[PDB]
Amino acid sequence: DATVYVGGLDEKVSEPLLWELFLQAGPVVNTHMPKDRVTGQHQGYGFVEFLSEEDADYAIKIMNMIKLYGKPIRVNKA
Amino acid sequence: FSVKCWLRYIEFKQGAPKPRLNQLYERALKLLPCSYKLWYRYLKARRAQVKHRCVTDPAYEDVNNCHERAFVFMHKMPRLWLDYCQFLMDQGRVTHTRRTFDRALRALPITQHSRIWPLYLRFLRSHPLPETAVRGYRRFLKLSPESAEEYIEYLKSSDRLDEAAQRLATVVNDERFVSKAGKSNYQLWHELCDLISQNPDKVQSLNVDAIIR
Amino acid sequence: MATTKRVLYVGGLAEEVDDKVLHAAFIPFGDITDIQIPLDYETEKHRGFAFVEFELAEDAAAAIDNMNESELFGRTIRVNLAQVYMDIKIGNKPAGRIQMLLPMTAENFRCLCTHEKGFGFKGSSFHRIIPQFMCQGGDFTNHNGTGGKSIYGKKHTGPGLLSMANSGPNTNGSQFFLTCDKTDWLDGKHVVFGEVTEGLDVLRQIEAQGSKDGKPKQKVIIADCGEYV
Known part of the structure; x- marks a missing residue:
């Protein structure tokens, strides 16, 4: 499960608000x-x-x- | 205080309608309207024990105690007055029915209507007068669509077609009540009564075309 | 011979008149006791008539004589003698109720309908809706896709079936979907656990808000939910 696939995003989002975003849950x-x-x-x-x-x-x-x-964000195992 | 001593002491009074009449009336009037149900049970037991003495006085003492214990009005007061009107329904004098309906007329709930209307139906025997007075006064006062319908059905059973056509005409006025019934039709029913007039009664060949028209 | 003189029939109603409008101002004793009207599952729009009940019979008769041929909304109306659920709201409009028949998977969904474990579906959305496929929700405090939690911890023959959303084998949480067609390609991948018993029409109203990419055209909310018990 160590990796997840995430769909449905807007390009003003980048790797940083994902960094910050998912480490809110647990560190990427x-x-x-x-x-x-x-x-x-x-x-x-x-x-x-x-x-x-x-x-x-x-x-x-x-x-x-x-x-x-x-808008909605897809997260599933991979 | 505790009205139980007023009920037991009211039942312990000896003699005729005196101590319990004034002592029980002032005792129930000086207390709260709570035990008054037990005062109605004691009024039924006292009315049953005094039922062998004349007519009026026991009914006036029990009715006066039940009406005095009910303060102004209540839900069960017209019911007790309707019970006294049921026991007094067979009398032979119109005073018991006049005071009956007069006591039941203090308020206007759904009760006492079935006391008043069949009283005019029974009094309507041998004379049209009480049926026309109580029917015309009942249909033209208070409020109800069904009051004039039941009074019209009771008036149609007599030998006169006036009060029936008078109630059907008063309900046929519409004005501020076109569909006074929704699905219930007081017009086509009166037209069916005109069809009953179209039956082989008048052979003059005049009122038939006027009733159909 | 009958005593059913309480339920009054009102006709010639407007498109705006409903159980509410009739309640605060109907024919007989409508707003009082109980009121009946033609309500859909997704549209939820009254026709023009309805039935109002009165606490008593006398009150009803008086309401007819009056309301009879009365003037309401600039119109002349006529008056005369006459398992779990989710209530769905689409945009700002009630759509109606879906009733569902539902051990561990059924118990989880049951508790999420009642909120008896301290959290559940009420106020959450159907966040992914694909026409001719499925309507997915249960991301209660998520509104994404496979977001939420089960009562136990973190973790297809036709339309109107309940099945668990997941992110692979043994990953059931709270997310679920209601099928909108036979979806047999999901067999053996998602755990089917119930069926719609009433309100398939309300499910079709949810599906009507779908897009090919799953984005709802209007918000679809579980306004209320619970159990019949």
């Missing part, structure tokens, strides 16, 4: 939030690696409680 050890080079903008889906698995399963339970730009 490895952050991945693609920067698209071609048009220089984000599609808004994320992958998160944690310290171990327990962090991330609690993360499955609590985690789908973040609303990014008035």
Whole structure:
């Protein structure tokens, strides 16, 4: 479970408000939030690696409680 | 204080309607209207024991005690007056019914209507006068659509078609009550009474076309 | 011979007149006792008529003679003698009630309807709605997707079935979905645990707010919920 997939975001969000955002729950050890080079903008889906698995399963339970730009945020195991 | 000593002491009074009449009347009047139900039980026992002495005086003592113990009005007071009107329903004099309905007329709940209207139906025997007076006064006063309907049904059972057509015409006035019934129709019913007039009664071939028109 | 002279029939009502309008001002004893009217599950809009009950019979008769051919809302109305739930609100409008028939999975959902463990569904939303697929909620204090918690800790043959949302095997929390078609590709992946018994029409009103990407077009809220017990 150490990693999660996160959908439905707005590009003003970046890797930092994800950092800050999910460490509110529990620390994101490895952050991945693609920067698209071609048009220089984000599609808004994320992958998160944690310290171990327990962090991330609690993360499955609590985690789908973040609303990014008035809008819904997908978090599921991976 | 405790009205129990007033009920037991009111039941312990000897002689005729004297100590219990004045002592029980002033005792219940000087107390709170709570035990008055037990005063009605003692009024039924005293009215049953005094039922063998004449007519009036026991009924006036029990009715005066029940009306005095009810203060101004109450829910059970017209019910007790309707019970005295039920025992007095068979009398032979109109004074018991006049004072009966007069005592039941203090308030206007749903009660006492079935006391008043069948009283005019029974008094309506052998004379049209009380049916027309109580029917015309009942339908033209207070408020109810169904009062004139029941009075019209009781008036239609007589030998006169006037009071029936008078109540059907008063309800046929509409004015501030077009659909005085919703689904209930007091017009088409009166038109059905006109169809009863279209029955083989008048063969003159005149009122038939006037009733159909 | 009958004593059913309490329920009055009101006709020629307006599109704005409802059980409330009739209560504070109906024909007979409508606003009093109880009132009946044509209410939908999603639309929840009265037609024009209805039935009002009166505490007594005399009061009802008097209401008819009066309200009869009366003037309401600039119109002439006629008067004459006549398992758990979720109440759904869509936008600012009540849509109606969904009733559901529901051991560990059923007990969790039951408790989340009653709030008997100190938290539950009341006031939460259906945050992901996909037409011809499903309506997902139970992210009570989340409003995302697979957010919430079970009563135990953190962790498809046709329409109108209840099934648990999850984030993989053995990850049930509080999130659930109501199916809007046969969704057999989810068999063996999500735990089905109940069915709609009344108010499939209200579920269709929720589905009407869906989009292909799941974003609700209007807020869909569980205004109230509980158990029949």
